[PDB]
Amino acid sequence: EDFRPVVFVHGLAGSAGQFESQGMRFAANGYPAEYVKTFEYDTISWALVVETDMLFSGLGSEFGLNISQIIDPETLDKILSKSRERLIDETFSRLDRVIDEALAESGADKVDLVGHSMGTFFLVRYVNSSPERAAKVAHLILLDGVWGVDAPEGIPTLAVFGNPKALEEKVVYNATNVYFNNMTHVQLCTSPETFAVMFEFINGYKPATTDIVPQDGDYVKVKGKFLAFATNGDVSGWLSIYPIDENGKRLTRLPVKFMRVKGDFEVRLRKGQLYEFQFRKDFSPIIYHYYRAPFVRDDLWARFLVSKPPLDVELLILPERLSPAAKETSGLLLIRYKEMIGEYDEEIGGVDEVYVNGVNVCTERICPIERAVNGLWVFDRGADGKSDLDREVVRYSIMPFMSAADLVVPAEGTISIAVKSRTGGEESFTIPAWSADRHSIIVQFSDYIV
Numbered sequence: 001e002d003f004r005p006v007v008f009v010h011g012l013a014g015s016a017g018q019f020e021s022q023g024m025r026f027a028a029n030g031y032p033a034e035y036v037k038t039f040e041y042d043t044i045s046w047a048l049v050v051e052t053d054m055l056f057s058g059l060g061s062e063f064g065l066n067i068s069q070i071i072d073p074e075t076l077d078k079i080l081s082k083s084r085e086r087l088i089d090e091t092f093s094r095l096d097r098v099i100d101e102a103l104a105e106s107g108a109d110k111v112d113l114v115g116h117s118m119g120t121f122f123l124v125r126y127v128n129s130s131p132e133r134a135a136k137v138a139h140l141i142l143l144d145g146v147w148g149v150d151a152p153e154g155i156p157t158l159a160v161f162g163n164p165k166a167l168e169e170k171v172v173y174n175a176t177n178v179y180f181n182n183m184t185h186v187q188l189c190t191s192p193e194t195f196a197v198m199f200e201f202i203n204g205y206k207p208a209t210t211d212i213v214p215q216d217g218d219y220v221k222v223k224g225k226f227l228a229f230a231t232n233g234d235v236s237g238w239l240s241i242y243p244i245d246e247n248g249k250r251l252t253r254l255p256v257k258f259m260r261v262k263g264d265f266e267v268r269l270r271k272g273q274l275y276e277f278q279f280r281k282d283f284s285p286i287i288y289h290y291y292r293a294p295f296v297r298d299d300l301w302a303r304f305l306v307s308k309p310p311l312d313v314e315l316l317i318l319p320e321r322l323s324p325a326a327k328e329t330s331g332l333l334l335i336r337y338k339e340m341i342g343e344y345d346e347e348i349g350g351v352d353e354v355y356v357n358g359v360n361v362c363t364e365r366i367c368p369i370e371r372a373v374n375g376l377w378v379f380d381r382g383a384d385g386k387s388d389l390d391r392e393v394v395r396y397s398i399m400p401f402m403s404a405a406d407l408v409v410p411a412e413g414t415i416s417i418a419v420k421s422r423t424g425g426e427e428s429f430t431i432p433a434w435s436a437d438r439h440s441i442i443v444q445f446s447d448y449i450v
């Protein structure tokens with residue numbers, strides 16, 4: 001009611017998915033869910049044309065390093081041909097539109113802006129580009145990004161920094177700077193404690209709760225989007241939603257919702273009910289099955305990542321998807337917007353455990369701290385029917401925020417997945433063992449277990 005809209009800007013290879021839990025937290029504290037907005041943009045182009053400096057002569061050395069490897073030298077020519085100033089103006093005008101719509105919709109005169117990682121560079125340039133744009137910002141929140149520069153003039157800014165070893169000397173001048181040395185890069189963005197500090201910083205009081213509070217009623221409104229990983233463009237395809245049982249078995253002959261999707265979609269589902277989101281993206285025979293915990297309240301920020309050029313990470317698994325053994329094994333992708341760490345460290349204070357059919361794939365070698373694993377690929381490397389966990393899957397060592405585990409997952413019956421979080425608590429799933437020749441399985445773990 002007496003709240004301002006907040007607009008979040010993600011980092012490189014990120015999306016609104018990183019603010020999904022904070023959105024639910026804002027709503028559980030009285031914000032109308034619609035007052036929390038996200039701005040999505042193409043991070044590969046932004047980084048290559050605008051943040052070149054951060055990319056190679058600074059912060060994001062990791063993506064910079066494997067830019068030449070992950071992208072077609074010709075394709076990179078096209079992106080690098082693009083004009084910097086044109087790109088900036090066109091992207092800033094689009095953000096101006098999101099902000100203005102948020103202002104009209106709430107009657108508020110200003111909004112709060114929040115950036116994470118590259119998003120902080122983005123927002124600082126944005127607020128500094130014109131007096132007209134800054135006048136509409138009540139508070140600026142910079143999460144684990146830019147340091148060593150001035151906070152925009154006259155804009156209350158708060159910079160929050162996490163543990164540096166995830167590749168207190170980080171200060172934004174004139175901003176309130178605080179630190180959470182117990183947190184990793186993405187975790188800092190989705191964490192309930194970052195939520196309490198952001199909330200307090202913009203509202204002047206500690207929120208009553210930091211939990212994702214189950215709302216009353218049988219239904220939840222879900223607004224989501226199937227988009228390209230990293231470039232974030234709309235993806236078209238067909239979506240079938242099926243309520244499922246404790247073992248992943250479809251409870252209905254026909255899907256409870258079937259629809260053509262061109263990016264965003266909105267649907268009404270049951271609160272606390274497990275669901276399988278099956279998707280077929282235009283021009284691909286593969287059937288995707290996305291699984292995640294039940295929705296306990298409205299979620300207007302759900303994201304289903306799809307692999308597409310020029311950064312088709314999924315092709316790295318094609319050799320195995322094409323082998324005859326592929327009819328015999330499953331291939332899955334585990335995602336958590338909170339680094340899965342298999343390397344013990346005191347400051348971070350804990351190791352996660354991730355079991356697939358009883359085997360722990362979050363090892364020191366597979367999931368070292370420096371890897372900041374948010375996406376773990378589990379499949380039979382080489383299609384040789386052997387689970388060589390101690391042999392690194394080299395092809396993924398080049399992808400940012402990812403890793404892989406050579407594990408044989410028989411395509412018969414079900415697959416059980418169990419995670420024990422480094423911050424405590426456990427979550428598990430049991431889903432069908434779809435074969436890798438025609439199916440792809442994606443399982444997203446919640447980024448916080450209370």
Ligand SMILES: CCCCCCCCCCCCCCCCCC(=O)O
Nearest residue numbers: 011012014117118229305307374375
């Ligand atoms: C099916 C293919 C989809 C690809 C799956 C990859 C999933 C991995 C999750 C990525 C986590 C987002 C990282 C956000 C950090 C941003 C860094 C920056 O801002 O510079």
Ligand SMILES: [Ca+2]
Nearest residue numbers: 380381386406
């Ligand atoms: Ca193997």
